[PDB]
Design a protein around this ligand. Structure first.
Ligand code: 5T6
Ligand code: NA
Ligand code: NA
Length: 379
């Protein structure tokens, strides 16, 4: 408990392409880089020589593979993936010293799933069975891990922005990874890591919106989304408020829509003209909340690959949604986040690694008195 040195720094990444952990599958072990994804529930890996992939799962080479004789088809916006289900033996070299028999979806065909240039080959869905494909009877990796071992039923994530890095502590917490105290918000329902936002402030100013809007039709904590994604109505109000606070300088209207980038000479990015953003989350006690506070350092994402420019180019990392609020890396990079599955709660503390300046830092503060917090959830 409290200290897990062999798991510190076990995550890597490229900005905008998520964080991945090294895993092994089959016997003898095949090493793969696997995206850490708290927004889905399948362990799905490349299993055929797609051209974007550094490597792939070669089932024929594993003496421990078992076929489930079941296919899986997964469509989404603009694409799909398709695979074949089985089980095999899975370890995390920089995780707990255990090996488990887990469900693996061997991906045989995909469109717009893998990234050309990225260093990962599969996805570790860490969310719940309710959203597994094809159905909730396909046991997610973490459920198998807990059933089959003595690893405690929780994991925590320290994502460090910028090639990025971080830690995934499986089965516990490392106190060196955060400062101050952890504050907990209940997991509203075990499908996504669903939470309830009860209040939103920009630079200290309440958006004074019916709090149901903040959670229309859900809010989730998702390591596999880059951005903070806000429902349309909340996003409109959020930028309107952000536009106002930052009107000391002007930017194209398309910038706030993430349709163009914005650039400053190096060393000369004006952080101070930008407002802090505070989300108040439902607390553990009736009528009690806490708030988490992020900086422009979190919501203005560094974009390296621009041949049209030669400066500090940033994308605005806040965007509309029709699927609800999504607290992606933008949020998580500010905090140490504890996915306390045993107690159905998510903990937040200031991350010991988060990017800030000398004037402002990310914050986790409470308690606050907030009434009618149950009304904030959408049915
Ligand atoms: C349909 C589907 C989507 C996902 C998804 C995902 C897929 C592929 C790439 C990225 C990604 C790309 N670039 C930066 C990042 Cl940070 C992530 C994210 C979409 O949303 C989340 N959270 N993960 C995961 C598994 C799924 O399979 C099914 F089993 F549900
Ligand atoms: Na167990
Ligand atoms: Na600490």
């Amino acid at each position: 408990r409290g200290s897990f040195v062999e798991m510190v720094d076990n995550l890597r990444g490229k900005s905008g392409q998520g964080y991945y952990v090294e895993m092994t599958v089959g016997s003898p072990p095949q090493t793969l880089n696997i995206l850490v994804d708290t927004g889905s529930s399948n362990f799905a890996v490349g299993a055929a020589p797609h051209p974007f992939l550094h490597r792939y799962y070669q089932r024929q080479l594993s003496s421990t593979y078992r076929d489930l004789r079941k296919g899986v088809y997964v469509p989404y916006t603009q694409g799909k993936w398709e695979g074949e289900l089985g089980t095999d033996l899975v370890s995390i070299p920089h995780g707990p010293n255990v090996t488990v028999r887990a469900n693996i979806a061997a991906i045989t065909e995909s469109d717009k799933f893998f990234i050309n240039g990225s260093n990962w080959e599969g996805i570790l869905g860490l969310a719940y069975a309710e959203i597994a494909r094809p159905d909730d009877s396909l046991e997610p990796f973490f459920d198998s891990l807990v059933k089959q071992t003595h690893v405690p039923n929780l994991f925590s994530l320290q994502l460090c922005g910028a090639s990025v890095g971080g830690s995934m502590i499986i089965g516990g917490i490392d106190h060196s990874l955060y400062t101050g105290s952890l504050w907990y918000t209940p997991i509203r329902r075990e499908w996504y890591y669903e939470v309830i936002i009860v209040r939103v402030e920009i630079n200290g100013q309440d958006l004074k919106m019916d709090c149901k809007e903040y959670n229309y039709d859900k809010s989730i904590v998702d390591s596999g989304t880059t951005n903070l994604r806000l429902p349309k109505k909340v996003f409109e109000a959020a930028v309107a408020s952000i536009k106002a606070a930052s009107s000391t300088e002007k930017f194209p209207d398309g910038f706030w829509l993430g349709e163009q980038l914005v650039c400053w000479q190096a060393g000369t990015t004006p952080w101070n003209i930008f407002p802090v953003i505070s989300l108040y989350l439902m607390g553990e006690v009736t009528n009690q909340s806490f708030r988490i506070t992020i900086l422009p350092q979190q919501y203005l994402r560094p974009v390296e690959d621009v041949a049209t420019s030669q400066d500090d180019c940033y994308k605005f990392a806040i965007s509309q949604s029709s699927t609800g609020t999504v607290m992606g890396a933008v949020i998580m990079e500010g905090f140490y986040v504890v996915f306390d599955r045993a107690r159905k709660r998510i903990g937040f503390a200031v991350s010991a690694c988060h990017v800030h300046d000398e004037f402002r830092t990310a914050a986790v503060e409470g308690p606050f008195v907030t009434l009618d917090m149950e009304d904030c959830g959408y049915n």
